[PDB]
Design a protein around this ligand. Structure first.
Ligand SMILES: [Fe+3]
Ligand SMILES: [Fe+3]
Ligand SMILES: [Fe+3]
Ligand SMILES: [Fe+3]
Ligand SMILES: [Fe+3]
Lengths: 157, 158, 157, 159, 157
């Protein structure tokens, strides 16, 4: 069943995103961007909580869960500036949104009303998340046009 | 119309479930499982509340409600152990779930977005209810393997 | 450099352990041992926090961290009773202890006093964790000699 | 006092027109990720609408007929490209708002309508404060916008 | 003996450092960087307190202490900008860490477990102090790329 397989891959996707946020924290902390690092660390935790949510629902609903590897984050190897990091995180959130939308499609095809209901808050959360990341990325891209200025976003905010 | 019929039948299923839980509470009380009896009594009241919620929504949405009989419960003629009661209550919740899904399917066919939205919290509640009853039945079935041990479920929890 | 490699592997081991504990919670929840499931979930969180503490220290100490894959837990394929799960968790904590000891050994060799100091509370925590898991496993093993008895004591927890 | 009754009715429209232009500014700022400036505009939008409601309440009490007109579509958003453009349009809006109220007070003065002139006094003084506040913001925005990225500071810190 | 001489010279190093931090406060104050000046003054007091801790332990352990002169700070004649000050302070903390690491080596060689235990919090504090100073220096160095911008680090933060 497409639906059971996708529900499992959603758990992996949440944990994958958690680890990618952790890699963003690390790059920021290594590069003395402690404010952005804390933001990424908080978002790492929150993603993991989302994965845990999906696991809990699956257990209740008898959707078998088999935990997959969480792959090593790949984007950090090539980030060189905060703009690079934030662009990768926007791309992650966009991918997280698609995965959830595909899962909802599969649920809709199956008439799985409970799964569709469970997913509603996550669809609305993703709208907010993509908006928030895109907005920070816009500020970062504007501020980084003047040397040193972005270092103000971090220290302030 | 199918949606209107299924929405009435839902009120009926909630009130019928309420009575079946009441029946289970009686069986337990009569057999000195006061803890399981109190649990069933609480669930009886809650399933009546769900029915009342459906009635309220229907009144607001001009869905005509014709209250049907609540049939005499009959599974409590045959119960001879707590496991038998909990199995029936599991089957009851599985029937409750099915009736909500039937109603949602009809709302979906009709593009009745308001009804589908109203139903969402009930779909999620049924997931929790079937899980919870399933888990209790697993405990009962395991503990009843040693004589007297299930009386500990009743006294300790519940 | 051996100390750096080992410090990275320790991060990996904490996050691996975190995932094995999650696996344990899933098995328990699926088999209606909700109390044991909650215990495993809490431990899963805590071992991820340990990982985070290693990453934080590394960042401060300029120990480069590159996040590795977190492997798929595999023991939940073979579990068929709580005893099996708790035994795998004991072995996991024994392995967590060994990785910390390998790390400390390398730091000692390198005369890395700060790393050794950082490790001390973890060495002491591992004593506690192996003792606690050993104690639960003994209790589980003894209670399950009578059908149903073990269930009655997940329920009291 | 047909002139006066007319202009008083017309002042409701002006307040609601201003409310919508502020809303428009809030939208432009949100769409372009100036959430601080967007919140300021949204608040002013609400306050403009309250001013209109005050006019309506007073008219009801004074038996000045109110007939609600179309609230015109804001149009300056088509051509805004930077925050400076937006704030300049909002200054123009407030200057127009001030003139409309002074034209109304002129018609009242002519009619010896002491009550209407008294009703308007706090509004004349509010407009003084609002043109000053907007002009001051526009001066800041214009200066900060001389260095790339710096204005994005104002939004994030202040606002 | 060498452990005893090194313990004495650790006291001197702490007081030396306190005076270098004082010098940094003076340069900042003189050049109207009141925020950085306050940071340096606070760090000067703290390093004097570390020296006092060493003295107190020495007295307890019958390690004779003979207070040495506190040398005049020398870097404060060359400093021309905040970057130069923070760089000298990083170097000071790097020297602080090396002095503690030499003392720990001597104690290790002597099997002096009490001295090693006493030093552990200091080892971990140095990790934090070098990270914090290095991070500030990174911020200073970036922000100073734009005329006047650094003067906002100070007044704001
Ligand atoms: Fe997420
Ligand atoms: Fe119900
Ligand atoms: Fe751990
Ligand atoms: Fe107004
Ligand atoms: Fe010190």
């Amino acid at each position: 069943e497409e639906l059971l397989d996708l529900f499992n891959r959603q758990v992996t996707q949440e944990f994958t995103a958690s680890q990618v946020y952790l890699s963003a924290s690390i790059w920021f902390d290594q590069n003395d961007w402690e404010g952005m690092a804390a933001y990424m660390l908080a978002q790492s935790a929150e993603e993991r909580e989302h994965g845990l949510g999906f696991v809990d629902f699956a257990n209740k609903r008898n959707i078998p869960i088999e935990l997959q590897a969480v792959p090593a984050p790949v984007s950090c190897a090539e980030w060189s500036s905060p703009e690079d990091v934030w662009q990768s995180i926007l791309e992650l959130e966009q991918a997280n949104t698609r995965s959830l939308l595909n899962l909802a499609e599969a649920a809709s095809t199956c008439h799985d009303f409970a799964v569709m209901a469970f997913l509603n808050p996550f669809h609305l959360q993703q709208v907010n998340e993509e908006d928030k990341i895109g907005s920070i990325l816009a500020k970062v891209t504007d501020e980084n046009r003047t040397p040193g200025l972005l270092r103000s976003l971090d220290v302030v905010s």
